[PDB]
Amino acid sequence: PPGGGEQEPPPPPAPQDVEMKEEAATGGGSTGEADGKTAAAAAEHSQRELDTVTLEDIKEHVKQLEKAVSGKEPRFVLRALRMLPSTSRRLNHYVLYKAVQGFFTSNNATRDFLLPFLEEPMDTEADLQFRPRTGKAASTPLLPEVEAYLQLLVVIFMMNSKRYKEAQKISDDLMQKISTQNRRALDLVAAKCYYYHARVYEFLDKLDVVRSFLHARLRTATLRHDADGQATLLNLLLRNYLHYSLYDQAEKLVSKSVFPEQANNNEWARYLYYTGRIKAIQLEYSEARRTMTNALRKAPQHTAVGFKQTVHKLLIVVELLLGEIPDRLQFRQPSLKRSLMPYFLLTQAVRTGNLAKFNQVLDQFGEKFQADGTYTLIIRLRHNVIKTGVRMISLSYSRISLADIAQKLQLDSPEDAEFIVAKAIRDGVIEASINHEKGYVQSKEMIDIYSTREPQLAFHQRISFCLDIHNMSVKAMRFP
Amino acid sequence: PKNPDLRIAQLRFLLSLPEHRGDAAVRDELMAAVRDNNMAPYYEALCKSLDWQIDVDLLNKMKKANEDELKRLDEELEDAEKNLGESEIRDAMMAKAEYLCRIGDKEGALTAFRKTYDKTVALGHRLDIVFYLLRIGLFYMDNDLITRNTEKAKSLIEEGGDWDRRNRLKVYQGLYCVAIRDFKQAAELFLDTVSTFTSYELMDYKTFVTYTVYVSMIALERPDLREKVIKGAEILEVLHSLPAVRQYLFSLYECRYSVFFQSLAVVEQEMKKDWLFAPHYRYYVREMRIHAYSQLLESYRSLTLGYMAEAFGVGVEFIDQELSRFIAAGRLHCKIDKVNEIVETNRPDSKNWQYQETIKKGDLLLNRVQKLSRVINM
Amino acid sequence: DKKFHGILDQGEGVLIIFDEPPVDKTYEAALETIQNMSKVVDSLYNKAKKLT
């Protein structure tokens, strides 16, 4: 109390003041923009939702004693807000109760009164007209309530709060979404409640119970129209079915719901991660690595974020399933130190023709390979141990004797050198050909890639994308 | 104090890291270490060398004497003589830190330099201290101090005085050769070789010529290399002193490739005796070996690697394996062959070169306006 | 040293003489504008970053 207790009065009141006026001006601003000029995609909806991912998770973790978040429940226990006097009565109460919680002690939430902080705030004439207010101020008290992590009769405090909030969401979904479309708000609300309800089903039994309900929310999605609702629920529905290590992937191959068609640069980024995971395991290697490449370069705007460490981890494997390998560890992180040492020393052995070192890597770093969800490399990367050099030779040489290629690939027999090169050309490693008469493996024709109509194909791709930006820009620019 | 000092940092390297090399460095360092009053840094250097000898307490009281003899000078000075700035308190207390740079470690010297930097008002005395920080950052190759004060030398100082910056031009590319920047920034401002006397600010001349002739044949192949280093005459004086260096030049320019390897063999082994050496040797030779190949495959388009067996060196299979490693490296734009034994080349045309650059820069700006169009419109 | 427009062959001992294409100018003037257009997108990149 003389050391830290004197610096206990400054942390409540300024987050009680100006952080309160954030959602007070936003929730006032989002409501009036839901009333008039209802197409508010170009408004404060997005960045406030970018804040609720980032800011309010690190603005507060505990329920903020001396009445900053512990005071939110005696603040919003009494909200009528129904008619224009009932709002202006409560606008006086927004002045009164915030002043009382800024001065003195209201109902102090000592981590236990959460269900009477879900009835009586929802009671005392709380509206479904302010269903964004009930939607936000039920999803935001998940975050002091989960991140306490004491988990002692709080799992049901999670469970009741989500079912209250989603029954409010269902009551929106059937009754009068008059020019509002709370799906923009309630998508990440459906996500954030079910990131941790997934975590609840990590501490306890399996989470196909989530997936049956998540089909039902996706069944009521896609029927109205798609405005990010199908997009957010699809990545959620895919994740457990990929997280389970059963068969599980032909369900996604038949999942013909491939189109969100616009995803605000962030759903589309990790959507391409999960479908790249799928196309890699069913041996469609070349299409997988190029959409893994598209996923890697789409959201790098982060700070050592860890899933960037994951997409970078898979992409080097699938290109080691194609022979080529780039520089990888040139952007070393405080966490990449753990993940560079296996895979750089892995491809060190892949480029060489060594195998007793390669099996030494497997015994050294099998636990991390099993932890990363990549058991399958040992059955599929031993293929490209011979396919790396034969692509390297057919890139270097032009007309090789197959007798000479056996010692150069240390194949220890000249007669099966027909068969590997037959496997290379039938699968399309190199466009070369064999003369089965005196040992020739001769290469392609002369390079003719300017006067043979091929520059027109790439030039048509760049027309069809660049002026497509032009037409999409002119429509999107002039709203007034 | 600091002026002949950098040869010591050569013998710190040469004695230590080649463990076989423990014969001749200690023969002319220890007799130089009992001289010059060198007392603080050599304790770890005596650990890696032969273990101990009792001259430590001999010069300990002698380094304490000249510490105290000039400490009592400038404390009596500041208590009797009442000028400040660049006063007698100034040049006595910089003589304390220059007693530290010659004798002590860096840490007492650098904090006395920062103590005396804010007591100055003239930029010439400021820059001479920044000369000292750059040299002591070059003693111990500490890459943190040298990046800072060079910006201090550029921005905060050298909008004033003049032609004490060419002394630090040789230090800007002393940084670039100890870095991997062996390519263009070193050879560009090494090219003004008109700085002659082997001073503190010009640490050597003849080895400076060898430094700027080794780095020179990577910056440029023939966009008139021959005017700046071969038609250059003031460079041609002192490479007339060194016959092996001049032979290394003219073998490459007059296309004598067999004696070029014998010259390049001596260079790489002679490079081993250097203290800014770590970026050079594994990268320098392989860049020059692929440099000689590229111009030799030029002027031919049907070469046979049997002609490499005598016009070039020997080793039919040696040329075969080294071209194979370099074609697979993405460099050395030609196509090696087996049983025909004809090194055919393939170089692009104008249009086949220009089409590749426009499709690389095209997709770069296309991706650039992909992301920008997604930042706007939510 | 570009005194001559030809090429040699070791496998034939045969000198071959050809010419040069001077039509580089259109593609050369094209890709210099991309260096200009790369900077104007960077100019609009931080213009949207400074204020939304």
């Binding site: 032009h470 002039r478 | - | 609009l44 213009k47 949207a48 204020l51 939304t52």
Partner: peptide, 30 residues
């Protein structure tokens, strides 16, 4: 590359010039 790109960037310039001048009159009405 010369006509489709440059016409797009000009129309992209009209995006930011509109959206700045839109909301700065919006947030400064009251």
């Amino acid at each position: 590359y010369l006509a489709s790109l440059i016409r797009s960037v000009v129309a992209l310039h009209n995006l930011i010039n509109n959206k700045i001048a839109n909301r700065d009159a919006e947030k400064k009405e009251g």
